[PDB]
């Protein structure tokens, strides 16, 4: 799995590119603003499209959590007299680099990052805030994966968070006196959040118009922020791409793997969790950052649990306790119900798993009853109930297409698994607890090769057609994979549209715009309660409203919960 040498130097070569190209468009005009915590330095900054925007990096909104705060909630930061300065980012979250397969990053990482063409608008704007995805493993708020050159053409503010990744940010231990609960990355975001609420009207940010939005893990974080009390109406927009907190890859119940994690690490002594949080406290963080791959077992790895630490449920209360319940009961109770909601995947999700899938060919047997992928709750814990192995059928219809399963009908069978399937029990468990706030699909169905971004070589997609998971990114975000591209090329006008879309919605909270290219003829109708068929705006060259394609196999994934309709 380790990514190849090519594109090593390839990675290499681009990333002196990227310093050489940060020099060159940064500018002599710095500006201070205020915050609650003190005066922070900001600096201008040019794009490709020869824009220019106000650049603040590195404001912390939360202590350094080293130390005795490994683990741990999030504390505010202290404030500092004079003038912090802000022109230049922070470390991201420890994390392995998937290119140089080596670890990378810092403890101290708890960072926000601010974006404005301008900072003294005449009337206020609307604020966006961008929460990464990367699996709560991997990912970061800098300029050379998610840079503002394209949102910053719209008068908008943008804010880039980071947050705590693996078990850095989701140890969970069950012991109440330890104040390990879990979730730490989590309430860092919350933390994040209360920074912008109380600050971004010192950008020209509306503090009464904030939209959360976010792709894959940045997705699911996105709808754990509108399912939390901890954040009862911070903002007021909620966009979740390909993802959100009911996807199985998105919870795990994590408590017993501290453990496992402390022995990969070399800890000698007994199963008990003040003693393993002991060891894990003194440990390099690189150490553990690097073992954590090794954390699952064979079974927990055939059951599909994909990340060993996790959004978690809580064992016990605290004050800063985010997700006290399992997220399909938090959903019945969330307030983030009713603020307009859009949400939407691309139109070949499972793409995403070509590189597992090429080292592990034997995967596509697992087609054959498919039960390793009937819902982990209705399932049996060998998968072999005969109630189980009729699940699996229920599935294997759905996606096998032939006599013998193909790559095609395994990548097809996870866009389902992992993105569809959770995207519609969400959507029918939220229209049983809301106020009636509008809710908005997209499909997002624009292949290109002509720009992309990294993810595309993680997914060894070089060559390979079709809109994978992650493939969208390349139109909202510069990344140092970019270029400068024609105005009237596909691309630039994708660009266009998506950035003109979001913006529109963060806005309103109603996507359309008859200011946006191609949608002069577009009627983009909200899902109600009693749609027995999703509508959608396909994103493509063209813009249409469709009925949801994946609509038939998305019933035949309802039907396993026949005889379970609570557990739906
Ligand atoms: B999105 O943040 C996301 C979803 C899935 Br499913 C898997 C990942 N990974 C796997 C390997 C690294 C990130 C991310």
């Not at 790559?407 to 389902?416: E, G, I, K, P, V």
Request: aromatic fraction near 12%; charge should be neutral.
């Amino acid at each position: 799995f380790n990514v190849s040498l090519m594109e090593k130097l390839k990675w290499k070569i681009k990333c002196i590119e990227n310093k050489f190209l940060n020099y060159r468009l940064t500018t002599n005009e710095t500006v201070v603003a205020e915050t609650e915590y003190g005066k922070v330095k900001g600096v201008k900054r040019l794009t490709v499209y020869d824009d220019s925007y106000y650049s603040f990096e590195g404001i912390p909104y939360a202590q350094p959590p080293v130390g005795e705060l490994r683990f741990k909630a999030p504390q505010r930061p202290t404030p500092w007299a004079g003038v912090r300065d802000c022109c230049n980012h922070k470390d991201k979250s420890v994390q392995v680099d998937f290119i140089t397969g080596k670890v990378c990053g810092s403890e101290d990482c708890l960072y926000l990052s601010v974006y404005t063409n301008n900072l003294n608008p005449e009337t206020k704007r609307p604020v966006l805030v961008y929460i990464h995805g990367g699996g709560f493993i991997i990912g970061e708020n800098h300029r050379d994966m998610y840079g503002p050159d394209y949102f910053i053409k719209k008068d908008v503010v943008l804010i880039n968070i980071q947050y705590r990744l693996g078990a850095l940010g989701f140890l969970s231990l069950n012991s109440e006196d330890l104040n390990v609960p879990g979730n730490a990355g989590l309430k860092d975001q919350v933390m994040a959040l209360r920074w912008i609420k109380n600050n971004c009207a010192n950008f020209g940010g509306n503090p009464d118009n904030i939209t959360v939005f976010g792709e894959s893990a940045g997705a699911a974080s996105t709808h754990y922020m509108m399912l939390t009390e901890q954040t009862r109406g911070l903002f007021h927009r909620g966009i979740l791409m390909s993802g959100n907190a009911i996807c199985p890859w998105a919870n795990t119940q994590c408590q017993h793997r501290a453990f496992t994690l402390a022995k990969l690490a070399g800890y000698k002594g007994e199963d008990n969790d003040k003693d393993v949080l002991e060891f894990l406290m003194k440990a390099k963080p690189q150490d553990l950052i690097k073992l954590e791959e090794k954390v699952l077992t064979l079974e927990e790895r055939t059951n599909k649990v994909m990340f060993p630490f996790g959004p978690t449920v809580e064992p016990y209360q605290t004050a800063d306790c985010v997700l006290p319940k399992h997220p399909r009961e938090m959903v019945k109770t969330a307030w983030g119900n009713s603020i307009p909601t859009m949400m939407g995947n691309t139109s070949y999700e499972g793409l995403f798993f070509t590189s597992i899938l090429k080292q592990m060919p034997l995967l596509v047997k697992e087609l054959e009853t498919c039960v390793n992928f009937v819902p982990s709750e209705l399932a049996d814990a060998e998968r072999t109930a005969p109630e189980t192995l009729e699940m699996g059928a229920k599935i294997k219809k759905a996606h096998v297409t032939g006599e013998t399963p193909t790559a095609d009908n395994f990548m097809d069978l996870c866009s389902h698994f992992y993105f569809w399937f959770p995207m519609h029990r969400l959507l029918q468990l939220r229209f049983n607890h809301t106020s009636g706030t509008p809710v908005y699909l997209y499909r997002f169905d624009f292949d290109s090769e002509d720009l992309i971004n990294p993810y595309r070589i993680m997914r060894s997609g070089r060559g390979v057609k079709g809109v994978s998971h992650t493939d969208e990114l390349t139109y909202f975000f510069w990344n140092q994979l970019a270029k400068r591209m024609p105005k009237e090329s596909r691309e630039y006008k994708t660009i266009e549209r998506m950035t003109g879309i979001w913006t529109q919605f963060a806005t309103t909270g109603n996507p359309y715009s008859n200011e946006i290219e191609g949608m002069e003829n577009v009627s983009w109708d909200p899902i109600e309660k009693s749609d027995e068929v999703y509508k959608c705006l396909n994103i493509s060259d063209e813009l249409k409203m469709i009925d949801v394609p994946e609509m038939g196999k998305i019933k035949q994934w309802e039907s396993m919960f026949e005889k379970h309709r609570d557990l739906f």
